[PDB]
Structures are given as structure tokens and as C-alpha cells.
Amino acid sequence: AMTLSDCQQELSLVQTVTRGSRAFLSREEAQHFVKECGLLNCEAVLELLICHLGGTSECVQMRALGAVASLGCTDLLPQEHILLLTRPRLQELSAGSPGPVTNKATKILRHFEASC
């Protein structure tokens, strides 16, 4: 955590994008998230999203995965670099019981692997 304590703007962003009752980001929310990512440290945002993939509820996991997918479909980080950072947690989730989070993590992982 201490290597992220100076990432308070990034934490606020991730807390914003992951709160809400719908499991899918809106077009507006995703575009806002991506715009703000461009102004902050993308890698730290991704590490904080990965933190929210564990120890949370199903809806927060779904929105955090959505945010990972959105960032992956930009050019803010090389997509091989997004894969390097996200592969372990995406592999763990994809090994889980069938369900929304398992399915969504699997599709994201298969997409990042295909691009490389």
C-alpha cells in the first residue's frame, strides 16, 4: 500500500468508477474514467483496480473489470504492459466458478493475450 500512498488522486478515481449499483459502466462514465487516466499515472490506477478485484462485492469486481477493459482498449499503456500487470489476477478470476465475474475476467484475459 505504501508504494501507492502518494497515489491519492488515482485512488479517488478508482473509488469513483467502482461505486454504483450497475455492473456495467455507462458510456459517459467510461469516457470520463479514460480521460482522467490520461492525466494521472495509469499504472498506479491499474494496480488500484487490481486491489479492488479482491475483498469486495460482485458489483465492485464487475465495474473494476469494466475499467480494466476500457483502459485496455486505449493506447495509454502498451497492451502487452496491461497484460503483464493484469494477467495474474485475471487468471485467478477466470479459474473461478461460472458466473459474471469469471466470465468477464476470462474475456478480458483472452483479448489481451490475443493482441500479443
Q: How many residues does the chain have?
A: 116
Domain with 111 in it: 1-116
Burial 48-82 (b: 16+ CB within 10 A, else e): bbbbbbeeeeebbbbbbbbbbbbbbeeebbebeeb
To what resolution in angstroms was this structure determined? 1.9
* CA 32 remoteness from chain centre: 14
Q: Number of structural domains, the chain?
A: 1
Task: Give φ, ψ of 100 to 5 degrees.
Answer: -60, -45
